[PDB]
Amino acid sequence: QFNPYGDNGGTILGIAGEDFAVLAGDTRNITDYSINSRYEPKVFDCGDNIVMSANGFAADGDALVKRFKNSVKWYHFDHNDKKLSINSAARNIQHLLYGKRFFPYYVHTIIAGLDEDGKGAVYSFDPVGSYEREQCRAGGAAASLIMPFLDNQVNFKNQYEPGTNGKVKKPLKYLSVEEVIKLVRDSFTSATERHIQVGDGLEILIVTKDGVRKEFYELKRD
Amino acid sequence: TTTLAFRFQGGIIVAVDSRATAGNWVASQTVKKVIEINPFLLGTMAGGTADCQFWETWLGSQCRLHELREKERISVAAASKILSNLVYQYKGAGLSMGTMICGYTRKEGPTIYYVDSDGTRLKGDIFCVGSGQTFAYGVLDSNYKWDLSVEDALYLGKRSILAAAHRDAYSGGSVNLYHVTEDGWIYHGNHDVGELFWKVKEEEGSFNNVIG
Amino acid sequence: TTIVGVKFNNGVVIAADTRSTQGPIVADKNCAKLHRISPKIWCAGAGTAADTEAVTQLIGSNIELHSLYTSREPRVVSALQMLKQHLFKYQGHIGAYLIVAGVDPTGSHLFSIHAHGSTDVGYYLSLGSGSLAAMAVLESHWKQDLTKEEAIKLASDAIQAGIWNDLGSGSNVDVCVMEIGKDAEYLRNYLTPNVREEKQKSYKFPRGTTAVLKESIVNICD
Amino acid sequence: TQQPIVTGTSVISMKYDNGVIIAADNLGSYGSLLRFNGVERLIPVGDNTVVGISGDISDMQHIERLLKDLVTENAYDNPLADAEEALEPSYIFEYLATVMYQRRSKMNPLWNAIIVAGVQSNGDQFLRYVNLLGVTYSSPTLATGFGAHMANPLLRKVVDRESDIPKTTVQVAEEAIVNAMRVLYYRDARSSRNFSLAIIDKNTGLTFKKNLQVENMKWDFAKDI
């Protein structure tokens, strides 16, 4: 029997700072035990300072990104070139995803950008459209490896102030873009070590009020 | 999930956990399971996150359209029945929802309606919904009186979620509290189980099963 | 896994990668897939990891007892005969796929065995999930009358093909060279082309970070 | 929901400094029966694109008709049909990619793996894959079926990343492709000896080679076994 779904592997990761946000994703594309491409980007600039990635089944991922990019275009046409805010993008994507509730897009979706107060924003979706804003989210094949590391290093979970008898928590603070990129690079090198579908290259899209910047790094190719 | 809402002398208490799961994978610990429909209506979410989140936000839009068309806030009965009639149309399709529509109106007073995805709609004073509903019931039933004070009712609701958060593997994160009065709903904070458990254990002397 | 075996002038060489997997997860990044049956008979094993190790040890044990009984150096065909009759008896339920090679008084030999108990003969062979990547290289570059240093190069190149192109293979290249008239030389981590890069950050925690409820000295003495 | 009947095996390809090369054997298999031997699985669109198709042949012939029709439709009311408004490889691909994904979404797929090889109007090399699932990807080397497992490893030894492309000549590239075709004939049970090969170069244009044969094969060592 024909199976309409497939698994193209890879993993993605979004972190939000005070006045910026990053959306990273490895560039490896796979089926079963074969590598299709060592450089196939899945993190996209969609306009209006919104970066997006839909990781899982690449055909559904590309379809969704394509539809959302198109949604941004028509939002401009219909509402006098108004900027699509990240919260409005999020709600719009929910309807895209839930529209196929009974034949789902097989993808974990993450978008990043800046909210209307200029602060960094990351939104994450399940395959059928439930969404939530967070400081932090890893998605895709190695999400289960990276996410607990992020809980510990971004949100300082399980970390207490030394000498306070485990009574005072380590206080929350925003991370600099330098610090965030260190965590992203360490997250992906760790994920590359222990997950077979993750590797080849890392592409990070950084979003500030000045626009979208890119950074590329090599990952292990085994 | 564990969600509850009960009626009492001073109105309605609504309490929910904040965990989201995908199998045994803890997907989130900070999810909002109460949706504020209007200043007098609340909806609780249990079951499929997308199903709940999508259709209860949609419910909010229908309630807004009612008050525009009828120049009057929708009744809790009518609001719950919009949702129940909707999910009944999808009966068999595989929607998964256990919801509670809580609110106050003049004609009804404080009212709670249980609505689920197989089309069950029930008016009642106490309900617990979700995978940890039984754990919440155990504590809530055994401490419930109609004459509870607002302070005590808030704590019991909080303590019942904590009970379930602890025992049910698929509940946890934090407790979100709400109090519904004749004047509308009032938010009573997010309470992380990470700190709340030890605070309750110490102060209350309960949870003796746990290594102190 | 990826494993290979290549015959040359005065003997035979086998090689293997060093990745062990659990589904998509890399369990062991440097496991030893090259097994010693007797001093000059070595096995490369793919398939169920516990089965390859257990079947190689059992036949290795029985080969040592046989060698002591007959006052003779063991033969590769004896190991081959014992392995195949054991594996056949279990109808493929023991998932051991082996490349058996070595030198004995009869000469130098190279065989493969499948889980159901069928055996092959050849000058070059490859088994495991990365056997197609390896065999592609072997079919491209192999020739009659290879030297020792040529065969090692060909073998390790065939393993490298698996390492880079097969997700089930990675990390390092182990090699064993069995030459007639000489001791077998096991070359553990003969190539290490997948060294982890320096991490961006030290995650050494301030002492006291972890909240503790109880301490106690554990008695290990009598 | 389908099952493939008459099928074609591997399609292999790679980029080189001035263009792309693509190849596929001339066999139409009917299960284990090697039924048809005169099947052409490389289909040129214009003078700048070749589409290589594996999988179900009835669906391949349908796709042929679609591409043929696309050329006709593009010529309509188009004075620059043989110039600036000629069909680009990127247009042909995106059209096929759309169709493949739409058919999978209707649970009635075209049972194929497809590689679109060509050269764009600005001289850039185009090489991209699409299959029955609508999955698309691009790489310096691309291959379908057994080619993915056996050809890609060999072709990647020549062009392992983007920077290796300018360093690779058409002679070196074609040599690798022809070698890969031989390896597939050794090891793929549904391959034939006869094959076609196409070169799309930004200077010399489209060169279509028919009736090629795998040769310089090593079989002599078999007598010793």
Added chain:
Amino acid sequence: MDIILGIRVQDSVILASSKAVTRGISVLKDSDDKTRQLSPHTLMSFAGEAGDTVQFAEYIQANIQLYSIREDYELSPQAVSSFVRQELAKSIRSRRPYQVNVLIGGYDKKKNKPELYQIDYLGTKVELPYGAHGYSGFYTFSLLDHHYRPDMTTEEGLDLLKLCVQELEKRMPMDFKGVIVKIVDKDGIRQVDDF
């Protein structure tokens, strides 16, 4: 079968076990005692598959009684629980396993301490302050997490137990026809007749 509870307090173990025996759409009996005395200071309640439950309980009972006669000595609750666990641990890999879940309430006379052990049909043993088998636990554990204190009296334990039965009678789907309650302490085993 269905409902079996257990609470360990300061000086005793209290076992509550449902009285109903249902088969199909008929409650065949409403006075069934789902327990066996293994030794003078050790009691075992049981629930699970029909036939298996009593067959297993009586088989364990016979063995412990045999031991008692042989050595002229009472095995500790810990020792009895370990014996029972091993029998179940064997059983689970038999041709037809015993589908029986048990609670073992005992008073260790050497330690002067009450002890409660929960063992499922797989042979999964745990010592607990309070225990339950089947769907009962889904209500009682959270309830006891709240109201239980380790220093309670037998009377306090019975009131705590009444609270559990009331909750079950309110929220459980099936009529389990009340419970038989038994207390295990330094003076042995006795049954509460008015519950």
Added chain:
Amino acid sequence: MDIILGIRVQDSVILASSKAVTRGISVLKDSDDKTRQLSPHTLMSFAGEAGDTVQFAEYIQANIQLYSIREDYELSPQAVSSFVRQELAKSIRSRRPYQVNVLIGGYDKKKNKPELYQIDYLGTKVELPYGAHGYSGFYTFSLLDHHYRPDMTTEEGLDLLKLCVQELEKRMPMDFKGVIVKIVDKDGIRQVDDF
């Protein structure tokens, strides 16, 4: 849902319907009224699939009320029962059938006679002196075969009904949390509050 009974006596029809609403291992409600008044002298009880039951009951209720307003006239119990049967008879061959079983108790004012109709989800209608849906019938029918007389009073009918509820509470596996009893006669529909 689960237990719905009906008894036709000399001058009235008496419907008894269980109060429990259970879902999974939780009794969500113990005061549920499984009935709708279709017209002043016609009452319908219902049991079956969750959601379907109330949706069907209210749909029938709306239609009968619509008829009453249109004609300024009350349909006979026989006419209402025939309408309901046909709706179920349509339903059973739909894409998704209503899985609802009903009893219709009515007092025909033209005949001055009580009437009880039993209709299952297939659209199988029968007029009866006494009726039951689901597993209840397996106990109550034989009981009523013995104790029922056609000339009984409403009080005698209630005592006969108490006998049925007692038997069900004794032998049924599930706790159905008692019944709501309603009487249909020449003066319309009224609820017995102390049962």
Added chain:
Amino acid sequence: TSIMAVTFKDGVILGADSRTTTGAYIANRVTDKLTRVHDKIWCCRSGSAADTQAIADIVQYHLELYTSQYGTPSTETAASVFKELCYENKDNLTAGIIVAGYDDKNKGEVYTIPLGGSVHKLPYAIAGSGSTFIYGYCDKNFRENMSKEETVDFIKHSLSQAIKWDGSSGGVIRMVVLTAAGVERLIFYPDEYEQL
């Protein structure tokens, strides 16, 4: 597989391709499907590689023990041992074996043993997946009492066609010639047989 054995004037010749498959992957392109169970009794193996190997090994053992006690076994005897194993273990075997041997009394003989474990003595036999495609050709071309060169051509042309149509067959054409003169191994490469 495509295998065949053909009796002729001076004895018998066995023939086979050299392809072994695991799905559509060729695990071994230089296989030897012609195996020795005795000096001048050989068999062609088709079906499961593991099953046919295990059977051939047991038969070779039985005939070696037979020879130790009673001298050279007949070809019929060898086929009977194959049959006994194939018939009694029919539920657990996938083996189509052709047995071919040379006596001096009986000359060349061919026995075929299909899946069920039945025995059939024939002038010539064909078996394996690729045999289906040459039933027509072989029936039309086979003649009794052919010469060595004619039989070699008959087998070469037959297996050439079987190999051409069957995807499960290919590589080289191995042959084994059984006569009073002795045992002769022949091999024929693609470049020769493909263009026949």
Added chain:
Amino acid sequence: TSIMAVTFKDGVILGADSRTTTGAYIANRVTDKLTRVHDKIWCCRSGSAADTQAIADIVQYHLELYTSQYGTPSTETAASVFKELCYENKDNLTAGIIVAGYDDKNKGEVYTIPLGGSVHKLPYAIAGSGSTFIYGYCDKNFRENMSKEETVDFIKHSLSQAIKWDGSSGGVIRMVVLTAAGVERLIFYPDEYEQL
């Protein structure tokens, strides 16, 4: 079935057996599997009797309507109509059809259409369950530009072998000769072909 169509110097000849089966029972031993879709365009039918009949009837209708408007259709056109039906209804059809016709410009032409609905233009085609057994024979014996008598013998000998090995084939060998001269029907009985 066993069916075949073969082009030759003067045109093309179609050939077929006459067996129809329902399991191992022969429902009709004198079937006519060679059917006319146009004056000089015929087809051989294999697979489901009902499916191939329904297809042939629709094609005959389409070509009759084609002829009314545009004159005589080409053999290629006829094969395209067959393909269209077979390809678009591949999920609900079990039909293996060989289309054969005679033009004066194009002479003899043969198109085969297997299960999937693909089209293949060949010098000659074979199909049906019994075709498997004669791939070897037909490849070895077919020559281009044969005479009428040679082609008749080629088909007769081929189908004779197919019939001999295939249980699903038998009865008489029907043939239809398509040339510029016209249409000629030939029949050959068991007593002749069996002893070839």
Added chain:
Amino acid sequence: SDPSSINGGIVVAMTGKDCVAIACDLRLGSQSLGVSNKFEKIFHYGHVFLGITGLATDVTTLNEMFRYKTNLYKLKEERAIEPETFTQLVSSSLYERRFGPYFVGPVVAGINSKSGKPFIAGFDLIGCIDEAKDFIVSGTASDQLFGMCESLYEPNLEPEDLFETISQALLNAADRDALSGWGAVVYIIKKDEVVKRYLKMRQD
């Protein structure tokens, strides 16, 4: 009804400078229902420590079995079993039940008393030895543990620093798994002293 994920639980082991650490959670549940928060999964036979995740009845059974076997070993050998030897014993015992296995994920940890070398090892349910320089992970949150260990771990940590690393690896991994947590225990093992610490963690 997947035997390895009915009860839940996790074990992790790490090596440091002249020391080893082995840690485990305390949860024992029956699918969603948490039953016990005292269920330790680490045992020791002399100076050799063994952690076992998986089906709890088998955890208990194997502990009892290896106590049995190491006691007889010591009586006959007149010395304590070493980690390398015990690792082999575990592997043999598990593979003995090849076609009816114990549904467990054992982890050996300890210091060889003769050489002073830190040693850790892991196994699948069927006996495959997985030796490591750095860390071994096991249980229902093994993916999480793999991610935590791979990123947090560095070689040659001091006992006090190693404690922080392994604890943070376990805690943050457990909090992303529904079936793991409910308390935790860490063993720090030096050549001739062993410290056991109970960790404070969230109880949901």
